[PDB]
Amino acid sequence: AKTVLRQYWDIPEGTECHRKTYATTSIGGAAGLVVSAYSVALKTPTSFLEGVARTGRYTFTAAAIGAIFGLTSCISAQVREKPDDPLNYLIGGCAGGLILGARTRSYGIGAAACAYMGLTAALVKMGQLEGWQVFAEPKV
Amino acid sequence: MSMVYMNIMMAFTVSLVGLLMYRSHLMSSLLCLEGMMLSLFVMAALTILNSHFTLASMMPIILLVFAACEAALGLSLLVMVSNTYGTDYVQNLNLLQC
Amino acid sequence: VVRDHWVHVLVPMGFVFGYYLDRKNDEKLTAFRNKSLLYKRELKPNEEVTWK
Amino acid sequence: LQYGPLAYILGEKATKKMTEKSKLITVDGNICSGKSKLAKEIAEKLGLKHFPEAGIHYVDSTTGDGKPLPVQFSGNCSLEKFYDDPKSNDGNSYRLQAWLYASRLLQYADALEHLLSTGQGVVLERSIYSDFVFLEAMYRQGFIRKQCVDHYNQVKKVTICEYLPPHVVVYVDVPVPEVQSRIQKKGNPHEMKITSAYLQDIENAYKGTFLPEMSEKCEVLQYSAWEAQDAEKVVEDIEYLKYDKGPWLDQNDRKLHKLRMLVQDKLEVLNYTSIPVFLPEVTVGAHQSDQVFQEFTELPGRKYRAGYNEDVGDKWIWLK
Amino acid sequence: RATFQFLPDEARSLPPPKLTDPRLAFVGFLGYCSGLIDNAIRRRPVLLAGLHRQLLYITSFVFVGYYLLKRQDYMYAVRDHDMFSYIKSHPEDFPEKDKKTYGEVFEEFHPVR
Amino acid sequence: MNPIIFIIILLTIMLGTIIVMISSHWLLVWIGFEMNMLAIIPIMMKNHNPRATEASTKYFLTQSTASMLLMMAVIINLMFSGQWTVMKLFNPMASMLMTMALAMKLGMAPFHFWVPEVTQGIPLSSGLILLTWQKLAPMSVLYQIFPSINLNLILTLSVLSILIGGWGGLNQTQLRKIMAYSSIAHMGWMTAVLPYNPTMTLLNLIIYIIMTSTMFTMFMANSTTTTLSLSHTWNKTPIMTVLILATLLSMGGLPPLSGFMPKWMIIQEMTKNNSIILPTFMAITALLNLYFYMRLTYSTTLTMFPSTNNMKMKWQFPLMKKMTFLPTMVVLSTMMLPLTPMLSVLE
Amino acid sequence: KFYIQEPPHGSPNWLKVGLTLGTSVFLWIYLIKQHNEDVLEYKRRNGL
Amino acid sequence: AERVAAFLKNVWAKEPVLVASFAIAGLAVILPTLSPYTKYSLMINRATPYNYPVPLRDDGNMPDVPSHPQDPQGPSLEWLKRL
Amino acid sequence: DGPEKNYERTMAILQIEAEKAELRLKELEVRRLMRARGDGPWFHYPTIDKELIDHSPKATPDN
Ligand SMILES: CCCCCCCCCCCCCCCCCC(=O)OC[C@H](COP(=O)(O)OCCN)OC(=O)CCCCCCCCCCCCCCCCC
Ligand SMILES: CCCCCCCCCCCCCCCCCC(=O)OC[C@H](COP(=O)(O)OCCN)OC(=O)CCCCCCCCCCCCCCCCC
Ligand SMILES: CCCCCCCCCCCCCCCCCC(=O)OC[C@H](COP(=O)(O)OCCN)OC(=O)CCCCCCCCCCCCCCCCC
Ligand SMILES: CCCCCCCCCCCCO[C@@H]1O[C@H](CO)[C@@H](O[C@H]2O[C@H](CO)[C@@H](O)[C@H](O)[C@H]2O)[C@H](O)[C@H]1O
Ligand SMILES: CCCCCCCCCCCCO[C@@H]1O[C@H](CO)[C@@H](O[C@H]2O[C@H](CO)[C@@H](O)[C@H](O)[C@H]2O)[C@H](O)[C@H]1O
Numbered sequence A: 001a002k003t004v005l006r007q008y009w010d011i012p013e014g015t016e017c018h019r020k021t022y023a024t025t026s027i028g029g030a031a032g033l034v035v036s037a038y039s040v041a042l043k044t045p046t047s048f049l050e051g052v053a054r055t056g057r058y059t060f061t062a063a064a065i066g067a068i069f070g071l072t073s074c075i076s077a078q079v080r081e082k083p084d085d086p087l088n089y090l091i092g093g094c095a096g097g098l099i100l101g102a103r104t105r106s107y108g109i110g111a112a113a114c115a116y117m118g119l120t121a122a123l124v125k126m127g128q129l130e131g132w133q134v135f136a137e138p139k140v
Numbered sequence B: 001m002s003m004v005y006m007n008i009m010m011a012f013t014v015s016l017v018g019l020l021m022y023r024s025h026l027m028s029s030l031l032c033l034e035g036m037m038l039s040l041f042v043m044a045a046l047t048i049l050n051s052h053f054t055l056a057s058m059m060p061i062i063l064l065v066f067a068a069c070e071a072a073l074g075l076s077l078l079v080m081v082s083n084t085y086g087t088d089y090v091q092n093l094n095l096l097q098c
Numbered sequence C: 001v002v003r004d005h006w007v008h009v010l011v012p013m014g015f016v017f018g019y020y021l022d023r024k025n026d027e028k029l030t031a032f033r034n035k036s037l038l039y040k041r042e043l044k045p046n047e048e049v050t051w052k
Numbered sequence D: 001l002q003y004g005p006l007a008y009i010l011g012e013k014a015t016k017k018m019t020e021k022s023k024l025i026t027v028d029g030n031i032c033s034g035k036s037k038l039a040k041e042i043a044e045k046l047g048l049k050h051f052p053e054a055g056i057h058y059v060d061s062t063t064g065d066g067k068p069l070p071v072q073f074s075g076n077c078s079l080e081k082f083y084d085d086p087k088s089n090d091g092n093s094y095r096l097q098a099w100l101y102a103s104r105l106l107q108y109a110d111a112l113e114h115l116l117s118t119g120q121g122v123v124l125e126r127s128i129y130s131d132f133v134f135l136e137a138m139y140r141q142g143f144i145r146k147q148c149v150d151h152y153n154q155v156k157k158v159t160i161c162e163y164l165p166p167h168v169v170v171y172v173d174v175p176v177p178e179v180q181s182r183i184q185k186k187g188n189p190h191e192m193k194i195t196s197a198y199l200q201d202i203e204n205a206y207k208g209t210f211l212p213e214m215s216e217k218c219e220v221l222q223y224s225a226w227e228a229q230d231a232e233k234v235v236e237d238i239e240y241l242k243y244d245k246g247p248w249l250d251q252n253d254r255k256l257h258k259l260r261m262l263v264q265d266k267l268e269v270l271n272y273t274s275i276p277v278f279l280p281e282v283t284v285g286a287h288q289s290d291q292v293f294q295e296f297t298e299l300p301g302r303k304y305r306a307g308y309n310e311d312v313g314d315k316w317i318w319l320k
Numbered sequence E: 001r002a003t004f005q006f007l008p009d010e011a012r013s014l015p016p017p018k019l020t021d022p023r024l025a026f027v028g029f030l031g032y033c034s035g036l037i038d039n040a041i042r043r044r045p046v047l048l049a050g051l052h053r054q055l056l057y058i059t060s061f062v063f064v065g066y067y068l069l070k071r072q073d074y075m076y077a078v079r080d081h082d083m084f085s086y087i088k089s090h091p092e093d094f095p096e097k098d099k100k101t102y103g104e105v106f107e108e109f110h111p112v113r
Numbered sequence F: 001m002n003p004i005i006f007i008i009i010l011l012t013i014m015l016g017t018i019i020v021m022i023s024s025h026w027l028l029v030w031i032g033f034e035m036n037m038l039a040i041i042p043i044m045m046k047n048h049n050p051r052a053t054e055a056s057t058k059y060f061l062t063q064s065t066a067s068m069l070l071m072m073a074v075i076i077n078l079m080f081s082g083q084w085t086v087m088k089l090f091n092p093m094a095s096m097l098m099t100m101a102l103a104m105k106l107g108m109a110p111f112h113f114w115v116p117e118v119t120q121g122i123p124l125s126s127g128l129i130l131l132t133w134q135k136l137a138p139m140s141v142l143y144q145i146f147p148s149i150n151l152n153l154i155l156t157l158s159v160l161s162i163l164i165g166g167w168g169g170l171n172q173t174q175l176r177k178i179m180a181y182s183s184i185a186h187m188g189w190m191t192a193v194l195p196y197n198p199t200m201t202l203l204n205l206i207i208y209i210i211m212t213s214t215m216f217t218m219f220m221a222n223s224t225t226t227t228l229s230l231s232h233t234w235n236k237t238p239i240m241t242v243l244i245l246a247t248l249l250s251m252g253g254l255p256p257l258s259g260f261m262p263k264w265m266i267i268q269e270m271t272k273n274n275s276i277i278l279p280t281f282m283a284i285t286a287l288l289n290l291y292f293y294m295r296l297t298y299s300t301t302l303t304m305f306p307s308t309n310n311m312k313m314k315w316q317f318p319l320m321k322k323m324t325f326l327p328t329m330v331v332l333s334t335m336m337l338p339l340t341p342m343l344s345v346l347e
Numbered sequence G: 001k002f003y004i005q006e007p008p009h010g011s012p013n014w015l016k017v018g019l020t021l022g023t024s025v026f027l028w029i030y031l032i033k034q035h036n037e038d039v040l041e042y043k044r045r046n047g048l
Numbered sequence H: 001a002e003r004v005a006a007f008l009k010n011v012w013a014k015e016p017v018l019v020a021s022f023a024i025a026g027l028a029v030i031l032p033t034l035s036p037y038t039k040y041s042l043m044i045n046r047a048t049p050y051n052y053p054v055p056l057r058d059d060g061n062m063p064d065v066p067s068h069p070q071d072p073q074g075p076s077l078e079w080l081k082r083l
Numbered sequence I: 001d002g003p004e005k006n007y008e009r010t011m012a013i014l015q016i017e018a019e020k021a022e023l024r025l026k027e028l029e030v031r032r033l034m035r036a037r038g039d040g041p042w043f044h045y046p047t048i049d050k051e052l053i054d055h056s057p058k059a060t061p062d063n
């Protein structure tokens, strides 16, 4: 994850959007596979095929959320000509939440996901700008 | 490292995967636990013998002593599982889901 | 002191005790008694401390 | 030293106090079958402790000053009311049966505690092992619902498994028509309302279930009405029993110590008699229970732990 | 400082907690509360029953609490001693600054209009 | 079990834990864990029923697996350093294995599945040991190896433990499973602060053990193991409902009660290291713990649930259970906040 | 009232009552003596 | 003594094998402390030279160390030859 | 209370709170330096004790 994460943050906002969508889609697909592995291991599928169906359904859903986010947030930065604005991640975050509602067929999950994915993504850009630490290194 | 360590570390990993991927018999998995102890004994014994760490030569012996206590404990529980259900199948041990 | 009215001294005594403890706190905060620029003066012939 | 693991280690072991005369005898039979008199004579001749049948107010007789409490502190369950209106709408029939089972459970623990701690045997009149005949009779007459029966069985399963059956089960076999005559001569107005079908159900359960069950694990002496009159001949029968069967032969000091730790802790004995299963017959609303519980604490010598009640003459409380 | 020692010998150069320490009084009050809870759970007269038992609750709480406070005070003395000794050993890391008055320091004014 | 045998087995449980805590040699640490595992299994099986057999079997398999991983870490450490001293490990792969092994023994998420099931399957007295005394040995080892622990791994385990512990407790009606999921959540706070200030790990551990012991002792006093059986307590020992309420509020971390002290100090040490997001996330997630603690207080003390007629027979007998140390434990569980600076005794 | 069974705690356990008061007195005397030692030692080390 | 003596004659009649076992184990535990030759066991074990005896640098003031192995100074095994 | 007592009591309070505040800042900067450089009493993680080494002549010379 460390290398796939660096790729995303190492290519500037609005420059090489296609490359950005590769990285976020790659992150989303990895997350979907992890969810599938635990799901398949803890709730055994009725058959081998059904396990593959569940995996491909989670991994695609997760990759779609990652793809729409990384693209939309890059397009917003390019069009708005503001590569440092958290608002772009909010729009990208909400769009991903909307796609999650789409793949789930449920406007309510779509609405809630748009709000919390949008806010969470916006918080991520702010922390990147300001240097917020999630797993802060011990210093004192 | 030297090539022997490749196969001993491989053996430990194979037994570890064997332990973590249950089938039906509880005794099959208890065997994988004894295998894990065997690979640790060999890997510990090689390192200690190669380095001429004289006092550490007793350490592998102590490892086997507590390997047997673990094995005896595992078999004692297998007896009680067998008595309750008539087989040592692990799928019978699911009462504590609720 | 009666068997029927001794409970009516608990709160008055708590006030007296609390009043007393507050004054003892003021005795640990005398580092600037008669030392501030605004109120520093001389002691009257008979006086001991400006405020106790 | 109150009994515990420390007393066990220092030597207080059951096999020291238990002799060939340390037996648990239960006397059973139908209503007005002469159990009480036969039980009292057997106890006196064999030199055992006699336990009069456990009734509604048995528990009062063992705590406090040993006198019956007002009926609100037994749930208001009434045996007289059961005869007058066996199909009462306030669930008296089962509530009484559930209260009586718990009283028997407590008496059995007291009997076992006496037997294990002193070695002197005991004589009971019915027990937890034979209490179900009344429940079966109640259900076949329609006095209680199938759910009451289910609740009774749930409580029995998790309670009767902890104890040992009696060494000797004495049964007095009085046929129903004779019993009806005996109940009729006795005189109390309410018991005269018992129907023969009810008494036949008690008899059918006694012979269809209790005795076949007890036989595999206890010595059973089945007497007729005439044989039972002379308690001396019954005592002679008990004195030459072989005692070759049942779970008592497998008991050791280790097991009887675990049993003693249970029967001496009455709250542990009664633990499952109040399982949270909400049958209307036995469920008490929070407002009623709160009121009754307050009144119970206002009785003489019940506010505090026994020995700390100054209202009834306890002294040295500030050092106790 | 000393390995696996509750009160190293160097701690005796510090004053002991006074027996009228407010923290020790609170600890004693906790012992009193423990005594009352002991009576309550056993349905004994809460205030009156078993005064000897209540006394031992207070005394044992105070006894342990006195040594905890003695060790608590010692460990904070050690923290201060370590910190000041380190400041002496590395002056360049803790320079004494030149202090300027507010007449000299420029602070921006933000009107509340 | 013979009373003397029971005492000897309990002393072997303690000796195994003490061996881990006084050992300077990895082999003796591993021996201590093995000895401890050996003596606790008979305590789990002491009641001999199919659920206790399943509980002990699941415990043995998990603990014995973790011991293999622990011994593997020690041997890797020996190969790359040529010594056995209990301290930082000299190989990052040895540090991962030892950290995962200790997380397994602690039942931290995602290695947590055994804790709810094993606790449910054994008596209350055995569950008390499992959720308190058994945390001491793995924690004492982490306290010594933390300089070489991977920061991302330990904080990932801590976060997952707080979430899963909080979420898992929401769906429980059995008291033992409620305590098990509570324990998983509290383990997360202990190891979250470990990389920053191990002293705060010990304070959290000590305060958690006191509160957990207090709750298990009160459950034992009434022989209650479900929510509903605990709801009859108001109609038997009213004082006990108040003590349960105070402890449950304390365990939720509400001021001015003791259980707020560890959360307070852990937030302080984390913010000093510019860790703001994590302590905020942990504190908000801990509100799940408070939610299902509060549910218990509702059904136990703050309302009066329906009772049964046979309960009246219980009014006539006094509590006979030992309830050892309960008066002291409940006071310490609730009234320690004014003495918080006493945490320096743990330095 | 007058109990049908003699209460376990009907009368004081004087062996216990004596031990409890004796321990309290001993601990208090030990604590006071210890405190005086510390005050005397503290002044000596500090030249007071 | 009678109770123990009566207990001894009983176990001889019933469990002579266990009587011999405890008697034999007892002598194992006791006799090594009472034996006068136990001290030589350590002396012999100490006198067996598995290692080379590395010489000391003659600093000019160790009069009790032999210069040559056949010199008088140093430990001797005359006690061992007469054993 | 007269204004002078309250006024000068406040200065006593301000002095203690100012002294404590400075020490708190010093402690955070001392902790930061001790942890980064390992040169102080705090964050002193143990190394192997050298009194455990045996310096006697061995069975072979080259060691
Ligand atoms: C100067 C002291 C000021 C008080 C400070 C209180 C601080 C909190 C201390 C908590 C510990 C309280 C003591 C433990 C409870 C024991 C009392 C009890 O359980 O029942 C009341 C009992 C009277 O009932 P009874 O059982 O019949 O006994 C007869 C004795 N005459 O006993 C009595 O007769 C009265 C005993 C006192 C009642 C205590 C009631 C509990 C209060 C808890 C509220 C939380 C405390 C307030 C929060 C701020 C803390 C400063
Ligand atoms: C952190 C800051 C705050 C400080 C926290 C400090 C916590 C630790 C301090 C100790 C806390 C426990 C204090 C217990 C006091 C009550 C003891 C008591 O009253 O016992 C009375 C009696 C037994 O007394 P007895 O053992 O015979 O005295 C002779 C001892 N050789 O028999 C009885 O009836 C007592 C029954 C109630 C006891 C509950 C069960 C515990 C058993 C205790 C046994 C005796 C304890 C002696 C305490 C001495 C400690 C110095
Ligand atoms: C000191 C500084 C630190 C500050 C932290 C806070 C300090 C307080 C810590 C509290 C620790 C628990 C000790 C509280 C003692 C409670 C005393 C009490 O409950 O009264 C006794 C009474 C028992 O009833 P009973 O024995 O049957 O007597 C006949 C009356 N029915 O009880 C009852 O009858 C009650 C039965 C009905 C249930 C009512 C429940 C609502 C009242 C709860 C009040 C206590 C809440 C404590 C929580 C902390 C409050 C801040
Ligand atoms: C910058 C990179 C951004 C990466 C974004 C990552 C987003 C997180 C994705 C996690 C994996 C998806 O998570 C999973 O989605 C599927 C949607 O099909 C949901 O699945 C649910 O919805 C649909 C239909 O109802 C079906 O999949 C399934 O029948 C149902 O269980 C799961 O409840 C959810 O657990
Ligand atoms: C439901 C809510 C759940 C909790 C939500 C919490 C929100 C937390 C927001 C993320 C915090 C900041 O997240 C992280 O910040 C650091 C900066 O310190 C960035 O770090 C980055 O900085 C440089 C440039 O700045 C990059 O070249 C490099 O790839 C990376 O190190 C990360 O790219 C960012 O992901």
Ligand SMILES: CCCCCCCCCCCCO[C@@H]1O[C@H](CO)[C@@H](O[C@H]2O[C@H](CO)[C@@H](O)[C@H](O)[C@H]2O)[C@H](O)[C@H]1O
Pocket: H010, H011, H014, H015, H018, H019, H022, H023
């Ligand atoms: C030569 C001196 C050393 C002699 C040491 C002999 C030690 C022998 C240990 C006992 C071995 C015999 O094994 C068994 O022991 C039990 C007692 O435990 C004996 O049985 C004995 O029990 C108790 C005493 O304990 C007596 O009241 C009983 O009369 C007696 O028979 C049996 O006769 C024997 O079957």
Ligand SMILES: Nc1nc2c(ncn2[C@@H]2O[C@H](COP(=O)(O)OP(=O)(O)OP(=O)(O)O)[C@@H](O)[C@H]2O)c(=O)[nH]1
Pocket: D029, D030, D031, D032, D033, D034, D035, D036, D037, D053, D079, D082, D096, D097, D100, D131, D134, D135, D191
């Ligand atoms: N519902 C119910 N009534 C019971 C139970 N045990 C006793 N009784 C009643 O209590 C009364 C006394 O029972 P008996 O002892 O058998 O009658 P008796 O007049 O005393 O004749 P003896 O057998 O000699 O003692 C009868 O009315 C019984 O119906 C019971 O378990 N359930």
Ligand SMILES: N=C(N)NC(=N)NCCc1ccc(I)c(Cl)c1
Pocket: A140, E074, E075, E076, E078, E079, F196, F197, F198, F199, F344, F347, I031, I042, I043
């Ligand atoms: N933060 C750490 N991990 N170490 C640590 N406690 N540093 C702070 C130093 C300290 C604090 C209190 C005392 I009392 C003492 Cl003597 C020393």
Ligand SMILES: [Mg+2]
Pocket: D035, D036, D053
């Ligand atoms: Mg009768």
